[PDB]
Design a protein around this nucleic acid. Structure first.
Lengths: 386, 52, 136
RNA sequence: GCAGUCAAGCGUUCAUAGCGACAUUGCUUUUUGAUUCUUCGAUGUCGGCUCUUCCUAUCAUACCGAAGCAGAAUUCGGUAAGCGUUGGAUUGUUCACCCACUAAUAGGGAACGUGAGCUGGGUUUAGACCGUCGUGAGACAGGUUAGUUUUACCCUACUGAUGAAUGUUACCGCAAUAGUAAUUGAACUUAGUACGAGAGGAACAGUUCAUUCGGAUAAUUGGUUUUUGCGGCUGUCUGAUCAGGCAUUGCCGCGAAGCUACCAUCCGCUGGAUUAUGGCUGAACGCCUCUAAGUCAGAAUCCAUGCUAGAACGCGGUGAUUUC
RNA sequence: CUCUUAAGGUAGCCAAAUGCCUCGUCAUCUAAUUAGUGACGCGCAUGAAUGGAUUAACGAGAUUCCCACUGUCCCUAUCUA
RNA sequence: GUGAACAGCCUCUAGUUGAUAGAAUAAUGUAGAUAAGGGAAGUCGGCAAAAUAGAUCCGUAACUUCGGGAUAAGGAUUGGC
């Protein structure tokens, strides 16, 4: 038989195995290609998504019927409170894969992160990095040497970096942590940048910049054990099917005498990790700035924080980000940003976007007012006002 | 971006929010939301409705 | 669409598939058209052709003059009745599904049109936009 | 059914652009036969639906050559299975015809894929009608009409999940491997240009959009409502009212959250090696030649980058490592 | 004209639940129809109580087309117990 | 009691309160449901389902065994005080 109507497969095989993730957090399976020409700076960052909202701007795409015309778009917020550096570590080549040889760590460490190593913190002695600390209190002795031990070696350097989470609304009380590769030149200088940056806070405004393209790396939502119709977009079967229709019928023939890996079957749907590329930035966030929510054109002292607050997340008191679109990951999740891998021309990765207006309307409803003030003006006084 | 009023209810309609309805008499109406629109399909009286 | 499109088109939610019937907004002599195809359409298993505003289709006349009836002819939508999105952000829907007739290349075989039409078919097929008194 | 060979002739002329007689060599098992080897202490019997994979003798998509190829469109051919290969009337249909969109609407296998996956329309029981035959019960690849579609909890395989043992425990992390994916068209310019007597009539670059597929999200639009949140209506009981009860969630209007939708939105890479082919140099063969040595460029190819799991017997780094 | 019949299918009827060739020929309904309807008739093999032709009403009978209706389908989603 | 009504729905007298229970709320299911735009394109085939649904008032075909067809079709109205 010669299947009668020859149509698309369902699915992408190159996202298998569709399973839960090792971790809630998404590792960076690659980093940008460095040039030994630059200043030191990172290749990434970490942030906590908080939601979406809507954006108005003016398009400059010369040939679009909307050229120099208004449009709307859909963006998200990513809480980017200033990352911390705590220790770096070094990697060197092999015949068989890059390989670590030291992890250097700072002297003083925040309690809000060393809880990462613990699982039952509240009954502990906390006893951590302590015999390491006493490696300091000597000038540099056991410590600087390793940095030199790295400079001697170690093609590739990275940074162990974490968050001042407590500023975020959440009650995780446990910072996250990760590596980042550096992409200046002169590793001997890279480490030195770092050695300075030990216990030193870092903000993205240094790193990323508006109208820049990036990738995003994060762990998609969880929905759970799902059926073969949704997990793969197969057909639903007709009304008169015995033993259910939300199925796939012929999972395989007689021979080959088995079930192929290529067949829609049940299984977890979500908590995967994905790589979302080329989402432009439209604005940087300043926690120490009212009018984060403003533009050239709007000009009210409005932040990004919506009336009644974000759903499930809350305020945006820290710094933040705006990125075009709908990124993988849900509210309250840690999101690994990343500069691109390459140079995209596209006539869109090159547009200097200017903002006209940002919607702050509540999303816990069908919001009208950006603001109580506006709201108060319109409706006027009520039985609550005096 | 321009700000409008609800052809039923009387609200500012910020961009890409609410809907529009058209009528073969060329006439236009704007709606903040499905509520007002549904009242409209119910061919109702925004002067006997209170919260307008 | 195709030969006559005065440019191109940002997608809009397809809401007039085959088997469908849509009024006639012209003065040609037909009250309805029977949408059966679409031009340049997709191609897929037991998906149907779908059609939208500005699109050019093939249809047939049920109700009207016999020179028209009982044969195929090209049509062009001007009204969808299904809510599409304009990049200004808004969602709009006419109250009717309405189209007109034409030759392959965009000549209204009628002489005028009634009721509103959409800027899409307007700027995409000129002659329509001429014989239109109205657009939105 | 598919392919070749020799070349009588056709093609204005011309055997071999394209074709091909008379004869002839073979190939495939996707027709049908032929045989009866297995299976009659029973392998579920046509077709359709869905789903995946695979082949090449390729319709299209890429790159190139040949033409009686000026352009245009077409045709013969080549590496290539990567990617795609439709909507519908009638028929139980396979097959076939018609319509229409199309870039294109190719052929095929997988126990004539696929019935513990559907269906059960035809066939193929029993009932029943008709026609022909038959004395008659009754027969008819002759027609018609109605006619029970069972079981998985086992083993494996597929998917997803957990997991003892490697001093413990925790955190970060490398990558053997395995898989992989993006595809297609139109509009504008070029360009009424190139070409051509003209009729007609292009191409790459470049910009804007879309098609199919995929993966994520759900700000807004829409959908869904047991938020039984709000309000409304009937019927009945609570003496009245108030507040409420039952009405297999009583019904209705809204209806946040959540979920979700090409009914919504966003995104979908860059380098190398190469095939075909055309070529550089240059021998044989004192000439020539893309070739033998050598060498260049170059495809939807291949491998990488990149993306996804992380080997449960692949690993490093690192913190801390119990006292009465 | 002729062979032949015991008689030679009358009247009516049809590709019909009987018509292989047959997806008969024409016209219609359709964008399109092996279908359905109408009509034609050398009818393999119609046909007169083996009952013929027709037929109002009735029919859980079969078959076709149209309106309304709708998640049957496009194209799939959600809630409930 | 509503209502035409020993219809369905609710209630009084009388009798029951019995069917293995608890926490959870994923798939596939069973039974009920809802769905934009479209409207049978699925389909063997409109199977299932959805719509219509009562009462009053009007209007009412071809055909007809003149008895029917006929709830024909098809339209309007309906509350409460």
């Amino acid at each position: 038989s010669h299947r009668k109507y020859e149509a698309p497969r369902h699915g992408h095989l190159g996202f298998l195995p569709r399973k839960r993730a090792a971790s809630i957090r998404a590792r960076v399976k690659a980093f940008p290609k460095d040039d030994r020409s630059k200043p030191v700076a990172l290749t990434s960052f970490l942030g906590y998504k908080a939601g979406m909202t809507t954006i108005v701007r003016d398009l400059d795409r010369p040939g679009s019927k909307f050229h120099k015309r208004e449009v709307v778009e859909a963006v998200t917020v990513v809480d980017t409170p200033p990352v911390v550096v705590v220790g770096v570590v070094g990697y060197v080549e092999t015949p068989r894969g890059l390989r670590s040889l030291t992890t250097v760590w700072a002297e003083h460490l925040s309690d809000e992160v060393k809880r990462r190593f613990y699982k039952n913190w509240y009954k502990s002695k906390k006893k951590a990095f302590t015999k390491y600390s006493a490696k300091y209190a000597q000038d540099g002795a056991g410590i600087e040497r390793e940095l030199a031990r790295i400079k001697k070696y170690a093609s590739v350097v990275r940074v162990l970096v974490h968050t001042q989470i407590r500023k975020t609304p959440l009650a995780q009380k446990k910072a996250h942590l990760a590596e980042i590769q550096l992409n200046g030149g002169s590793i001997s200088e890279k480490v030195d940048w770092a050695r300075e940056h030990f216990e030193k806070t870092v903000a993205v405004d240094s790193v990323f910049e508006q109208n820049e393209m990036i990738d995003a790396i994060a762990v998609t939502k969880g929905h759970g054990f799902e059926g073969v119709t949704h997990r793969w977009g197969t057909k639903k079967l007709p009304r008169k099917t015995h033993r259910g229709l939300r199925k796939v019928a012929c999972i395989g023939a007689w021979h080959p005498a088995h079930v192929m890996w290529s067949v829609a079957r049940a299984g977890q749907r979500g908590y995967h990790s994905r790589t979302s590329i080329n989402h432009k930035i439209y604005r940087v966030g300043k926690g120490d700035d009212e009018a984060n929510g403003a533009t050239s054109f709007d000009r009210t002292k409005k932040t990004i924080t919506p009336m009644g607050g974000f759903v499930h997340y809350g305020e945006i008191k820290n710094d933040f980000i705006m990125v075009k679109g709908c990124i993988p990951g849900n509210r309250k999740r840690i999101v690994t940003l990343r500069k691109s891998l390459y140079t995209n021309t596209s006539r869109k990765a090159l547009e200097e976007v200017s903002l006209k207006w940002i919607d702050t309307a509540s999303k816990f409803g069908k919001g009208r007012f950006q603001t109580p003030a506006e709201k108060h003006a319109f409706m006027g006084t009520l039985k609550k006002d005096l | 971006m321009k700000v409008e009023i609800d052809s039923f209810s009387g609200a500012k309609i910020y961009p890409g929010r609410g809907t529009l309805f058209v009528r073969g008499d060329s006439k236009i109406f704007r709606f903040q939301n499905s509520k007002s629109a549904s009242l409209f399909k119910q061919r109702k009286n925004p002067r006997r409705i209170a919260w307008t | 669409s195709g030969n006559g499109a005065q440019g191109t088109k940002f997608r809009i939610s397809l809401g007039l598939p085959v088997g469908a019937i849509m009024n006639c907004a012209d003065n040609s002599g037909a009250r309805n058209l029977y949408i059966i195809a679409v031009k340049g359409s997709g191609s897929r298993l037991n998906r149907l052709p779908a059609a939208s505003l500005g699109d050019m289709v093939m249809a047939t006349v049920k109700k009207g003059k016999p020179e028209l009836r009982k044969k195929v002819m090209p049509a062009i939508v001007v009204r969808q009745a299904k809510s599409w999105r304009r990049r200004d952000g808004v969602f709009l829907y006419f109250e009717d599904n309405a189209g007109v007739i034409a030759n392959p290349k965009g000549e209204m075989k009628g002489s005028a049109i009634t009721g509103p039409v959409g800027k899409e078919c307007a700027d995409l097929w000129p002659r329509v936009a001429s014989n239109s008194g109205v657009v939105v």
